[PDB]
């Protein structure tokens, strides 16, 4: 893909088509629904899960005591550093996974389409196909809904594609 | 100061919300508190890569 | 005229549920417990020397 589409407001992934009937755009429900489900599960894991701790050691001192003070400071500092490391690593990993799952859903949709147009189209390489037959808005709908039959348009597209 | 509200996490700076997994207000906590970390901000992505148009 | 050829993987009627990053609960063929939670109830005299 080259960039994104700012005009999409009823979904996250979609299709743009230019045929003899004009130019149109429409989003895909299933892919964006799956992405939303995964991110909501991620948030449900992270947010709202905090355990209780009531009585602990002291962590601020107004006096000079020596050994025990040194040990308590060391313990709290070690705990803090380890938990901060864990937090930074968890955030990095979860964000990488979010990016990966979104890109995977985009590629899933692209492949689902490409396999539907078996020989009636070619991959131009810019995230856009070239369909080699007269395909109207109803034909585009048959594509996206999953009802497109290649046999109907197969011979015409093979002709316009090899001669 | 003592107020009249509801929060299950108390720090010497006041009560704080107990939804985010981490916090850096203070390390001295009482209740269902998020863990103290040194980071001032850790942001979690809730959307795909953004290449504008 | 022409033949078809399918690619697939196996499965089992009774899988077990595990946890990953994507899914809190997902079913796999077989899995092993990593948390020893059972004990006999007695202390073994070997290999460590014990003094009751």
């Amino acid at each position: 893909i080259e960039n994104g589409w700012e005009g999409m407001v009823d979904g996250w992934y979609g299709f743009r088509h230019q045929n003899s009937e004009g130019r149109g755009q429409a989003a895909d429900l299933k892919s964006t629904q799956a992405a939303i489900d995964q991110i909501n599960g991620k948030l449900n894991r992270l947010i709202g899960k905090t355990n209780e701790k009531f009585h602990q050691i002291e962590k601020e001192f107004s006096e000079v005591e020596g050994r025990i003070q040194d040990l308590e400071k060391y313990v709290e500092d070690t705990k803090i550093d380890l938990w901060s490391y864990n937090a930074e690593l968890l955030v990095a990993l979860e964000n990488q996974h979010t990016i990966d799952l979104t890109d995977s859903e985009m590629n899933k949709l692209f492949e689902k389409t490409k396999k539907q147009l078996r020989e009636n189209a070619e991959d131009m390489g810019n995230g856009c196909f070239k369909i080699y037959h007269k395909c109207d808005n109803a034909c585009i709908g048959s594509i996206r809904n999953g009802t497109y039959d290649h046999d109907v348009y197969r011979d015409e597209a093979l002709n316009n594609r090899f001669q | 100061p003592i107020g009249k509200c509801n929060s299950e996490c108390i720090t010497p700076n006041g009560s704080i919300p107990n939804d985010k997994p981490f916090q850096n207000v203070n390390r001295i906590t009482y209740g269902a508190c998020p863990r103290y970390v040194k980071q001032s901000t850790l942001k979690l992505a809730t959307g795909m890569r953004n290449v504008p148009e | 005229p022409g033949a078809t050829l399918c690619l697939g993987h196996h499965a089992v009627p009774n899988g077990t549920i595990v946890k990953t990053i994507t899914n809190d609960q997902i079913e796999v063929t077989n899995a092993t417990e990593l948390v020893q939670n059972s004990s006999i109830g007695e202390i073994c005299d070997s290999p460590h020397q014990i003094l009751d």
């Epitope: 629904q33 599960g41 948030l43 947010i47 | - | 899914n23």
Partner: antibody, heavy 130, light 109 residues
């Protein structure tokens, strides 16, 4: 939490029509698609209708299709249901509820959340008999 | 309609499981969810997106889904869990919400 005043229950003669309405407060009603579900006495849980957060999408069950209408007002924060040609298989409790549904029924602002806003109203009893 | 066995049973602390079979139109394509109805009261939401529990729900209730089969497990079942449990999912063919028959679980008295 959610404070809803429900209204419209009662007894309605066969062949006549019922009209229920539950008014909600305590949240942004303006961005949650709503459901009407029903529960016949004895047992059972049958779904009736669903309406988008802007009316743009309504859908009914084949069992009550063609004789019912779901509607909503975001100004008065009101959800409402109308059903005609009632028979004994329609005497039941009617719940106005926010169930989990496809994402496009709710607004853009609530697509992603760790909360999953939800509620079922108490039953609204309608009975068709002499 | 969705297929839930009429009855379930167990002993206090047994981790019972309820199942829910569907079709390619609803479960194979969409997520499921699970509600609990205590006798004489409105149903309450337990599970959504096949494994997610809302704020109120304890982690004793868990869910799963594979293909056309969803499952709802209760680990530490106790005195206050005798109720009705409903599995439901969105169907794209009917373009609606299809519920399950319903399952009554009883404890070892």
């Amino acid at each position: 939490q959610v404070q809803l005043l429900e209204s419209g229950g009662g007894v309605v003669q066969p062949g006549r029509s019922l009209r229920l309405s539950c008014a909600a407060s305590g949240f942004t009603f303006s961005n949650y698609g709503m459901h009407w579900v029903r529960q016949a006495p004895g047992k059972g849980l049958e779904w009736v209708a669903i309406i988008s957060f802007d009316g743009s999408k309504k859908y009914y069950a084949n069992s009550v299709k063609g004789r019912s209408t779901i509607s909503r007002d975001n100004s008065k924060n009101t959800l409402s249901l109308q059903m005609n040609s009632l028979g004994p298989e329609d005497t039941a409790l009617y719940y106005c509820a926010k169930l989990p549904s496809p994402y496009y029924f709710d607004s853009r602002f609530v697509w992603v959340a760790a909360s999953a806003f939800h509620f079922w109203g108490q039953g609204i009893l309608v009975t068709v008999s002499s | 309609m969705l297929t839930q066995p009429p009855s379930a049973s167990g002993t206090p602390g047994q981790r019972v499981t309820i199942s829910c079979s569907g079709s390619s139109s609803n479960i194979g394509g969409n997520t499921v969810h699970w509600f609990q109805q205590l006798p004489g009261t409105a149903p309450k939401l337990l599970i959504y997106t096949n494994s997610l529990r809302p704020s109120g729900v304890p982690d004793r209730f868990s869910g799963s889904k594979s293909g056309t089969s969803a499952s709802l497990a209760i680990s530490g079942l106790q005195s206050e869990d005798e109720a009705d449990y409903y599995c439901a999912a969105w169907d794209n063919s009917l373009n609606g919400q299809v519920f399950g028959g319903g399952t009554k679980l009883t404890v070892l008295g």
